[PDB]
TrEMBL record, chain A:
Presence of keyword Nucleus: yes
GO biological process terms, semicolon-separated: nuclear-transcribed mRNA catabolic process, deadenylation-dependent decay; positive regulation of translational initiation; transcription elongation by RNA polymerase II; transcription initiation at RNA polymerase II promoter
Record keywords, A-Z: Nucleus
Family: Belongs to the eukaryotic RPB4 RNA polymerase subunit family.
Region (Disordered): 1-18
Compartments (UniProt record): Nucleus
Classification via InterPro entries: HRDC-like_sf (IPR010997), RNA_pol_Rpb4/RPC9_core (IPR006590), Rpb4-like (IPR045222), Rpb4/RPC9 (IPR005574), Rpb4/RPC9_sf (IPR038324)
Name of the protein in question: RNA polymerase II subunit B32
Automatic annotation (TrEMBL), chain F:
Protein name: Transcription elongation factor SPT5
Source species taxonomy: Eukaryota, Fungi, Dikarya, Ascomycota, Saccharomycotina
Residues of the full protein shown: 226 to 809 of 908
Highest taxon of source: Eukaryota
UniProt domain KOW: residue ranges: 89-116, 202-229
Family per similarity comment: Belongs to the SPT5 family.
Residues spanning the signal sequence: none
Entry's localization field: Nucleus
Function: The SPT4-SPT5 complex mediates both activation and inhibition of transcription elongation, and plays a role in pre-mRNA processing. This complex seems to be important for the stability of the RNA polymerase II elongation machinery on the chromatin template but not for the inherent ability of this machinery to translocate down the gene.
Provenance organism: Komagataella phaffii (strain GS115 / ATCC 20864) (Yeast)
From TrEMBL, chain G:
Species name: Komagataella phaffii (strain GS115 / ATCC 20864) (Yeast)
InterPro entries, alphabetized: NA-bd_OB-fold (IPR012340), RNA_pol_Rpb7-like_N_sf (IPR036898), Rpb7-like (IPR045113), Rpb7-like_N (IPR005576), S1_domain (IPR003029)
Cellular component annotations (GO), alphabetically ordered: P-body; RNA polymerase II, core complex; RPB4-RPB7 complex
Record keywords, A-Z: DNA-directed RNA polymerase, Nucleus, Transcription
Annotated protein name in UniProt: DNA-directed RNA polymerase subunit
Domain S1 motif residues, every copy: 84-164
Any GO MF annotation of the entry: single-stranded DNA binding
Cellular localization per UniProt: Nucleus
Signal peptide limits: none
Membership in a protein family: Belongs to the eukaryotic RPB7/RPC8 RNA polymerase subunit family.
Function, as annotated: DNA-dependent RNA polymerase which catalyzes the transcription of DNA into RNA using the four ribonucleoside triphosphates as substrates.
TrEMBL record, chain H:
Protein name: DNA-directed RNA polymerase subunit
Domain of life (superkingdom): Eukaryota
Species assigned in the record: Komagataella phaffii (strain GS115 / ATCC 20864) (Yeast)
Family label: Belongs to the RNA polymerase beta' chain family.
Full protein stretch here: 1067 to 1114 of 1743
Physiological role: DNA-dependent RNA polymerase catalyzes the transcription of DNA into RNA using the four ribonucleoside triphosphates as substrates.
Subcellular location: Nucleus
Length: 168, 518, 88, 58, 84, 262, 171, 35, 93
RNA sequence: CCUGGUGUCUUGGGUG
DNA sequence: GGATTACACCCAAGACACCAGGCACGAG
DNA sequence: CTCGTGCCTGGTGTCTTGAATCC
């Protein structure tokens, strides 16, 4: 039905088992290669999004479109009624509410601070932001790929994440 | 539109990749293994599973749905089976190429007899066309009469190579054992050659002009036979309740019987000289199943005495699949009758008999501008002219106006189609055989007339090389809005008055009118 | 069964002389039983689709093998018209 | 000519047919790149915008 | 990429007989499926006639994509090509 | 031992002919110097001949019309001899497939064998009609169904024992036919049970019409099609079928041509 | 796991839709057909970016049928989960065979043989929960699980989790 | 292409050096030994 | 509609007419192909709306084609002689 | 109360 | 050694054999 | 009533030796 820029995938003589999606082994399949191409043929890094980025973009896109539907005229339950159809109403409401209960940095002030702090494979950089951690010991266990990289700063990463983190 | 809706995207064909079917792939697309030559269960209706008419292969009967795709016989394409061969046999089409490969490679390990160190040979691998490269290589290596263990180690085995000769369906290799001594030529069985071919390296596979993904060289030996569905070999009823089978059906039974007897040998009484007679016979049946015009040996015969119609003979010649059904074919919406002349018709008109005009039709789409006009045709029905034969809905269901007794209760919706009768000024393509040049096919405007001949204005007899001594001509009716416009704006008679053949007209005033005008 | 009319056959399965026939009309009714009621299959002969005329004469006899055997001759008249061919 | 031989030889050497000829497309029943088929026809979205607003798709 | 800019178009500015036939047929077809017609329809109500009327007034809303041998192409609108 | 190719089906004849030649020449100055000859059914189209010299093989076959004239004889190895002469089941309670008669192809249980050892009593699902059309072949037989003695009682029978009836001179015990077959008439090897065995074990059309108004007034015809109001009469007089309105017709009935009161 | 993907959809347009607001109809048409749908190749398509400004290109007319074919290139927010990815969740159901957890659009099933023995299902408690002493798994409790297998139905995808490992569970 | 083929073939169908159809045949068949 | 009538329509340049004659007005047939292996091996149940090329384990990359029935027949006869005619819908160079 | 299948392979004689 | 040898169309005129086994009928 | 012979049906399987040019 719907297709992408990546095409053909004609048969090759040697098979491959670096295709099976394994986040531990950095296998994201043929569609989510490290170097993608946009609809003009230009090269582009894979766009993986943390929970904090994603909350701003999706909410902005929905209210800008909602304003556009109103000729140019906050709460998650109100923002999800913009969609068309009960099937669409469901998936969008559940995604905001899920993000509403797990996004630490729920505003653009803190988020841009986290954005500048983080901006080396692009997938790992996005993983560190999504999974909250206390110490260096907790990060290399649950995410065993950070082992043999020999470039920490990790502690100051976690300290800034936890300091920017508002109380609850 | 005659096809029910399917969500799969519609695309056109841009490339045809030819190649060979691997043994593994044949099994992957097969839906059943074929073992028993008895077609019927026990002559008590319903054909035997695992037999040659196993219902998983498909339906050629209007009342049994396919047990694989659920579709009716019209839509169901048929699905292949497979038949395992007890012993690998040669493909009859590829023997002379197999023979060529033997003189190129080592008959022990299978490596190309020459390297890039040889200057002329290094030039030959650069040749871009695979066929010419393969021939250029073989032209060099032909005279190399021993596989060297050592460079001129290259991976060689040191053995001298035989001179392989073809003797019918058998290949003989004569090895020169190390002046002159005694050489012993033994038969090079398919199984022996099969194992040798699987050990050819990927790098030498490419240099031989073969292709690792599409045409791997051991796939020229047949180990499992694809069983075509019944659509390829339909049954026919000679005198209603008596049906004979297609030549392929009988021939596949013979291969299947012969396959069982090879299994019947290796487990008990094999006097060796019997194994060679039974294996060669399996090779024979598989060969004449594909090609029954093998030079130098008698043809396989039916019990009626006439030769078996092999697959190769199905495709060649004037009546075969290519020249008889694809480069040309029989077509709908055509008509033919004797022609007569009429001076009181315009140059671009053709007089069309009423009976022909009621049989042919054009599907005119219903719009706001013609809906009132088209309803009048519907009331008149198929037997009064000007009338109509069918009303086609957007779903495709046709209403046959011969049998619709409540014809007065039809209301037409926009977007429907009415197949109305042929009517005045419709363009049609007119044609007389033999079509020697482009003005053998010109578009004329219909004028419906009584009597059963086609009428032509006399000045068009010359480009058709027609006269009225018994000649017949053909009429073709375009079936859509796009082709009507193509006919009137490209092929119409007045556009054809001057021909590019000799930059001069091909029509003039002729016969009576020319005599009289002087 | 065939799509044409069977109403010109008499009870003996044969049409009688003097009856006009048109295309696809059945003129000889014959059945064949279906092997293993409602057991037979039609094997009848219709008049050629492009023709018409009058049944002129019907021969009934048996052949060398002793089964029944019929011939039906149809006559019509062809009147010259546009398109017919002539020669000195 | 040499119909079956061409096709056997084509298989054994894995020939690619790029479908640019007239004959290729005719036998596959596709619009051939010749005459009225030698180009594509696109819809002029720019010229449609000069129509009035009551003609608009909803 | 393949598209050639408007200022650098090199193919002939006259509508060919083949382009004309395809345009008339395609537009005719669309009208019979009840596409909005861009000219006044008086007495001439045949689909082909309406399409021929639109052509004569330079009002057919279609673009010719003329393929060149290498695969590149020049898009020409039927509004700008000169019809004899 | 040499093998020789012979016409299919003529192997026994060739063995016979060789024996006659051998016996006829015994003790003469030109004896046939072969020892034996034989033909194995499993080895179609071959005869084997025992001798010391190849010339004796040619001598044995000279003039034999069943032998292929090509110099096709082949030598057998000593290590292959005994296999040429290898001579090669059936137990009560086991299944076999019948090879002859209306029960051809049917699965049957072996009930018992004759004392002599030739025919075996088989237990079979019957194919009967209960004499329904009496005043059989394998192509015009009946479906299989267990014998029903009450159906036989009703429709057409001798009781012999508990659950045992003789019906039309065949024996049925607890619904099964018990019938003797030659052992050569059953298949005991490589039987494949089937799926089925696993489950078991308008009133004026075509009437003659006269036309009473119009240009065709007085002509005979037949109603070919009567969809509505407009009829299709196949006129007799010219070879044409016309469309005609219903007001214009007279229909034939018991008494003359009757208007639309029929 | 969220990504931004540049996608495209082939749209066929009937000729009766050839009016001055054609592009705006197509923009509405794209959104109705794509938003909220799932595919095994990309995951759930959550929202499309910059919907009212998408450049649809030119439509190819299909020979012989009159209808027009647009290739609408676009950019969307997509959500696909992955095997090996550790994620948080909100439990939707608790049953004798494990629990079901809503991670945004879909639901993940964790079976009993991959749950530690000390977490005991307690129906008598009010409200029902998986309980310990300093642990509390009620509906809405943050839990940390790891996706160990993805199965594809091409309509909705199904992922199976596990809490049979270190540092996974309630926090 | 096709126009060229028909333009040359059609006159041939109605038609001491060799001329007419036998000479035409030598050309297309580019025979090494002409008559 | 023989070989010589085919040539006349080419000379007229009436490509659209020639396509219709040899398809819609005759033996037009719809087939399904696998986008990966290019064979006509797709098993298509249209009322259940489920498609699968078992060889490629592919239920998503599948296309439909309109080709002559006699061409479909031709390819099945070629398959029966171990020739693989792979129909791809895109070029690659 | 809508759907609705009648053969093939040759050979010979003819038409333009 | 094979392959090449105009196009389309009409219509009338034809079809497995031999051997073995089983069943039925007639005669003793 | 039993045995033998003849006819019909079904199943399985081949073989005495006997138009011309071109590439
Ligand atoms: Mg003439
Ligand atoms: Zn099917
Ligand atoms: Zn070697
Ligand atoms: Zn595939």
């Amino acid at each position: 039905v719907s297709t992408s820029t990546v095409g053909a995938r004609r048969r090759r003589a040697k098979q491959q088992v670096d295709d099976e999606e394994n986040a531990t082994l950095l296998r994201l399949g043929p569609e989510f290669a490290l170097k993608q191409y946009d609809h003009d043929g230009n090269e582009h890094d894979l766009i993986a999004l943390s929970l904090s980025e994603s909350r701003l973009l999706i909410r902005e896109a929905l209210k800008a479109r909602s304003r556009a539907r109103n000729g140019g005229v906050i709460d998650d339950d109100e923002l999800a009624k913009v969609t068309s159809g009960a099937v669409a109403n469901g998936v969008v409401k559940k995604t905001l509410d899920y993000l509403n209960t797990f996004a630490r940095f729920k505003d653009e002030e803190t988020c841009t601070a986290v954005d500048q702090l983080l901006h080396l494979h692009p997938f790992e950089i996005a993983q560190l932001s999504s999974l909250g951690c206390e110490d260096v010991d907790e990060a290399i266990t649950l995410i065993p790929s950070l082992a043999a990289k020999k470039e920490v700063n990790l502690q100051r990463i976690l300290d800034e994440l936890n300091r920017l983190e508002d109380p609850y | 539109s005659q096809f029910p809706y399917s969500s799969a995207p519609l695309r056109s064909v841009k490339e045809v990749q030819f190649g060979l079917l691997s043994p593994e792939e044949i099994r992957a697309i097969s839906v059943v293994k074929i073992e028993y030559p008895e077609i019927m269960d026990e002559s008590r209706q319903r054909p035997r599973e695992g037999g040659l008419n196993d219902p998983k292969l498909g339906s050629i009967d209007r009342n049994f749905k396919c047990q694989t795709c659920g579709e009716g016989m019209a839509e169901c394409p048929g699905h292949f089976g497979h038949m395992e061969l007890a012993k690998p046999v040669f493909h009859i089409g590829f023997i002379p190429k197999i023979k060529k490969v033997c003189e190129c490679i080592c008959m022990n390990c299978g490596k190309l007899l020459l390297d890039e160190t040889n200057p002329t040979m290094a030039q030959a691998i650069r040749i871009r066309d695979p066929k010419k490269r393969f021939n250029a290589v073989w032209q060099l290596c032909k005279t190399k009469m021993v596989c060297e263990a050592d460079a001129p180690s290259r991976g060689g085995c040191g053995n001298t190579q035989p001179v392989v000769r073809k003797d019918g369906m058998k290949l003989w290799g004569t090895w020169k054992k190390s002046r002159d001594a005694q050489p012993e030529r033994k038969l090079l069985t398919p199984g022996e050659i099969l194992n040798v071919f699987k050990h050819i390296s990927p790098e030498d596979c490419f240099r031989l002009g073969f292709n690792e993904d599409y045409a791997r060289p051991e796939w020229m030996i047949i180990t499992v036979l694809p069983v075509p569905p019944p659509q390829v070999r339909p049954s026919i009823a000679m005198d209603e309740t008596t049906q004979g089978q297609d030549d392929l059906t009988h021939k596949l039974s013979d291969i299947l019987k012969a396959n069982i007897n090879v299994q019947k040998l290796e487990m008990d009484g094999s006097p060796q000289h019997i194994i060679n007679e039974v294996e060669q016979l399996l090779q024979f049946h598989v060969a004449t199943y594909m090609d029954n015009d093998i030079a130098g040996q008698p043809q396989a015969l039916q019990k009626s005495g006439r030769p078996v119609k092999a697959i190769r003979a199905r495709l060649k010649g004037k009546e075969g699949r290519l020249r008889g059904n694809l480069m040309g074919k029989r077509v709908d919406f055509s008509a033919r009758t004797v022609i007569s002349g009429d001076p009181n018709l315009e140059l671009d008109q053709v007089g069309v008999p009423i009976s022909i005009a009621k049989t042919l039709s054009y599907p005119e789409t219903v719009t706001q501008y013609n809906i009132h006009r088209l309803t009048e045709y519907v009331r008149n029905g198929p037997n009064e002219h000007p009338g109509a034969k069918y009303v086609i809905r957007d779903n495709g269901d046709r209403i046959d106006l011969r049998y619709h007794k409540r014809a007065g209760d039809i209301v037409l919706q926009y977007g429907w189609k009415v197949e109305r009768h042929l009517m005045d000024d419709d363009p049609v393509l007119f044609n007389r055989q033999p079509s020697l040049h482009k003005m053998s096919m010109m578009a004329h405007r219909v004028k419906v007339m009584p009597y059963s001949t086609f009428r032509l204005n006399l000045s068009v007899t010359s480009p058709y090389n027609a006269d009225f001594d018994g000649d017949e001509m053909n009429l073709h009716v375009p079936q859509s809005e796009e082709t009507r416009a193509e006919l009137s704006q490209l092929c119409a008679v007045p556009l054809q008055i001057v021909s590019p053949q000799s930059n001069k007209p091909v029509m003039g005033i002729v016969q009576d009118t020319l005599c009289g005008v002087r | 069964l065939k799509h044409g009319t069977y109403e010109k056959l008499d009870e003996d399965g044969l049409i009688a002389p003097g009856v006009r026939v048109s295309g696809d009309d059945i003129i000889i009714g014959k059945t064949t039983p279906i092997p293993p009621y409602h057991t037979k299959r039609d094997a009848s002969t219709p008049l050629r689709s492009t023709e018409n005329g009058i049944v002129d004469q019907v021969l009934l006899t048996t052949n060398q093998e002793g089964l029944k055997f019929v011939k039906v001759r149809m006559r019509t008249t062809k009147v010259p018209q546009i398109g017919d061919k002539f020669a000195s | 000519e040499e119909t079956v031989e061409i096709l056997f030889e084509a298989g054994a050497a894995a020939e690619l047919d790029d479908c640019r000829g007239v004959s290729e497309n005719v036998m596959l029943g596709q619009l051939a790149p010749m005459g009225t088929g030698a180009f594509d026809v696109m819809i002029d979205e720019k010229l449609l915008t000069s129509l009035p607003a009551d003609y608009a798709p909803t | 990429e393949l598209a050639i800019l408007k200022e650098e178009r090199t193919t002939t500015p006259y509508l060919t007989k083949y382009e004309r036939a395809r345009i008339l047929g395609t537009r005719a077809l669309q009208i019979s499926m009840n596409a909005p017609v861009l000219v006044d329809i008086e007495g001439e109500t045949d689909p082909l006639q309406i399409a021929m009327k639109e052509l004569s007034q330079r009002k057919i809303p279609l673009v010719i994509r003329r393929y060149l041998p290498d695969g590149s192409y020049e898009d020409w609108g039927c509004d700008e090509l000169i019809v004899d | 031992i040499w093998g020789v190719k012979v016409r299919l089906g003529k192997e026994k004849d060739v063995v016979r002919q060789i024996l006659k030649k051998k016996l006829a020449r015994e003790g003469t100055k030109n004896p046939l110097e072969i020892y034996s000859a034989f033909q194995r059914d499993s080895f179609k189209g071959h005869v084997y001949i025992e001798a010391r010299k190849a010339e004796a093989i040619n001598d044995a076959l000279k003039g034999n019309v069943n032998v292929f004239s090509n110099n096709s004889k082949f030598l057998v190895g000593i290590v292959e001899y005994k296999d040429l002469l290898r001579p090669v089941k059936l137990t009560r309670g086991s299944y076999v497939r019948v090879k002859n008669g209306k029960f051809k192809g049917d699965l049957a249980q072996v009930d018992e064998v004759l004392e002599n050892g030739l025919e075996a009593r088989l237990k079979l699902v019957p194919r009967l009609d209960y004499g329904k059309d009496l005043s059989y072949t394998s192509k015009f037989r009946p479906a299989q169904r267990l014998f029903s003695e009450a159906e036989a009682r009703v429709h057409e029978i001798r009781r012999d024992r508990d659950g045992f009836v003789t019906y039309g001179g065949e024996e049925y015990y607890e619904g099964f036919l018990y019938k003797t077959f030659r052992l050569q008439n059953l298949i005991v090897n490589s039987i494949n049970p089937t799926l089925n065995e696993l489950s078991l074990f308008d009133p004026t059309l075509n009437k003659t019409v006269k036309i009473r108004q119009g240009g065709y007034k007085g002509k005979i015809g037949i109603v070919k099609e009567a969809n509505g109001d407009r009829f299709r009469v196949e006129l007799h007089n010219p070879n044409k079928t016309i469309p005609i309105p219903c007001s214009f017709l007279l229909i034939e009935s018991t008494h003359g041509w009757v208007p639309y009161e029929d | 796991m969220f990504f931004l993907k540049d996608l495209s959809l082939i749209l066929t347009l009937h000729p009766s839709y050839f009016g001055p607001q054609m592009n705006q109809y197509l923009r509405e048409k794209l959104l109705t057909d794509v938003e909220g749908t799932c595919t095994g190749q990309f995951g759930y398509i959550v929202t499309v970016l910059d919907g009212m400004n998408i450049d649809v290109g030119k439509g190819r007319i299909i020979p012989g049928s009159g209808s027009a074919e647009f290739e609408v290139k676009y950019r969307a927010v997509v959500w696909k989960p992955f095997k090996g990815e550790v994620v948080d969740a909100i439990v939707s159901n608790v049953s004798p065979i494990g629990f079901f957890a809503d991670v945004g659009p879909l639901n993940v099933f964790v079976s009993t043989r991959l749950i530690p023995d000390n977490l005991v299902y307690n129906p008598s408690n009010s409200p029902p929960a998986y309980m310990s002493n300093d642990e509390l798994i009620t509906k809405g409790s943050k839990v940390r699980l790891k996706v160990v297998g993805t199965r594809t139905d091409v309509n909705e995808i199904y992922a199976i989790g596990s809490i049979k490992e270190d540092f996974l569970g309630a926090i | 292409g096709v126009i060229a083929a028909q333009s040359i073939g059609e006159p041939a169908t109605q038609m001491n050096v060799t001329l007419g159809v036998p000479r035409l045949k030598e050309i297309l068949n580019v025979a090494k030994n002409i008559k | 509609f023989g070989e010589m009538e085919r040539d006349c329509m080419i000379a007229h340049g009436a490509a659209g007419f020639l396509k219709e004659r040899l398809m819609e007005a005759s033996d037009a047939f719809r087939v399904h192909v696998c986008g990966i292996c290019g064979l006509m091996s797709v098993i298509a149940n249209l009322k259940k709306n489920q498609f699968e090329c078992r060889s490629c384990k592919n239920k998503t990359n599948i296309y439909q084609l309109h080709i002559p029935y006699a061409a479909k027949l031709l390819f099945q006869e070629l398959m029966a002689m171990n020739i693989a005619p792979r129909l791809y819908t895109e070029r690659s160079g």
